[PDB]
Amino acid sequence: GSHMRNVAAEQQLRELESTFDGRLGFVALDTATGARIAHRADERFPFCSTFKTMLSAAVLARSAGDAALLQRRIPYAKRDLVRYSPITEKHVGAGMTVAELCAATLQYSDNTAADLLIALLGGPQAVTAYARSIGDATFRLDRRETELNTAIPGDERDTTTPAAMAASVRRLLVGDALGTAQRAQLNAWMLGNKTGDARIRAGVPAGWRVADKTGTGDYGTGNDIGVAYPPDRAPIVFVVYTTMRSRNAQARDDVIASAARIAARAFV
């Protein structure tokens, strides 16, 4: 790639933001060189369900020191379900294994699965502590699903910055924050995501595999974070956060995909 392409890409991100009534937080990192394409990289955004990557990583880290954990099956009843639980609603009673809950919350954004895992770890503060332990001094998880999706302007609960999340995604999926085998498992889960086809995935070429996690919330908040793996180049980290002025707004898959496409084409 080139510096002039990266600078031009950053201008294109400004122009893309100028087309909608909201803000765009964007970081893409070419891990061949650390080259960055960014917009509003240090502003806080409500992360909505993209925190489920950090959650699942924390669970994997705990499993590395407990051989029984991934197969532990956590029971729950119908009345324990929270809204948007497409997988866990099928297994009320005996419930699902911790590994299955991680896969459900990553691949279908299942909220009861997320809340069961947050409780397993000792509450939202345990997820924040895990983030700190991998070098993320920005990330904060304050609430559970579904309250963490309120995305109120000026509220710092359940927020991070695009730069902090891109460094964490890099360290988790590409680097050495997890052991080799846990990293592989987290990648596999996110590569099998079912909710991201219209976001980062829609902005990259057919041969690039994308391990991503989406988030959607109030104020038309539309997010996607992850790593794209071109077949014969270093991985590229993508972090896309968008949120709108109006509380009632819809999320914009097309904007998210366009932001990803701008960086994908600039890096090659």
Q: Which residues contact 172 (CB under 8 A, 6 or more apart)?
A: 53, 54, 57, 134, 178, 183, 186
Return the amino acid letter for 51: F
Residue 242 three-state SS:
strand
CA 107 to chain centre: 11
Cβ-based neighbour number of residue 50 at 10 Å? 26
Q: Residue 146, preceding bond cis, omega within 30 degrees?
A: yes
Look-up: residue for tokens 């279908």?
Answer: 108
Exposed e or buried b per residue across 173-209, where buried means at least 16 C-beta atoms within 10 angstroms of its C-beta: bbeebbeeebbebbbebbbebebbebbbbbbbeeebe
Which alpha helices (DSSP H) does 173-233 contain, by range?
180-191
85 is catalytic: no
Tell me the structure's resolution in angstroms, rounded to a single decimal.
Answer: 1.4
How far apart (Å, rounded) are the C-alpha atoms in residues 70 and 56? 11
Residue 223: strand pairing partners: 215, 241
Q: How far is CA 207 from CA 5, 54, 81, 172, in A?
A: 22, 26, 38, 22
How far apart (Å, rounded) are the C-alpha atoms in residues 82 and 56? 18
Q: Which residues contact 93 (CB under 8 A, 6 or more apart)?
A: 75, 77
User: Of residues 49, 63, 168, 258, which has the active-site annotation?
Assistant: 49
CA 203 to chain centre: 16
- Could you give the angle at which helices 51-63 and 111-121 cross, rounded to 10 degrees? 50
Q: Cβ distance 49 to 193 under 8 Å?
A: no
Residue 191 three-state SS:
helix
Which alpha helices (DSSP H) does 73-179 contain, by range?
98-107, 111-121, 124-133, 162-169
How far apart (Å, rounded) are the C-alpha atoms in residues 113 and 173? 21
Exposed e or buried b per residue across 120-143, where buried means at least 16 C-beta atoms within 10 angstroms of its C-beta: bbeebebbbebbeebebebbbbee
149-155, long-range: CB < 8 A, 24+ apart = 149/46, 149/48, 149/49, 149/215, 149/216, 149/217, 149/218, 149/221, 150/46, 150/217, 150/218, 151/46, 151/48, 151/217, 151/218, 151/219, 151/221, 151/243, 152/46, 152/218, 152/219, 153/219, 153/243, 155/46
Residues recorded for the chain: 268
Look-up: residue for tokens 């729950």?
Answer: 76
Helix (DSSP H) and strand (DSSP E) numbers for the chain: 8, 9
- The tokens describing 151, both together, are 């995305």
- The tokens describing 258, both together, are 């366009």
Nearest C-alpha neighbor of 256 from the set 230, 221, 227: 221
Return the amino acid letter for 63: S
- Sign of the torsion formed by the C-alpha atoms of 154, 138, 167 and 64: negative
Which alpha helices (DSSP H) does the chain contain, by range?
3-17, 51-63, 98-107, 111-121, 124-133, 162-169, 180-191, 253-267
Which alpha helices (DSSP H) does 171-213 contain, by range?
180-191
How far apart (Å, rounded) are the C-alpha atoms in residues 34 and 49? 26
For the chain, the distance separating the N- and C-terminal CA atoms, rounded to the nearest angstrom, is 6
- What domains, with CATH codes, occur in the chain? 1-268 (3.40.710.10)
How far apart (Å, rounded) are the C-alpha atoms in residues 86 and 112? 9
The dihedral formed by the CA atoms of 102, 103, 105 and 110, expressed in degrees to the nearest 10: -130
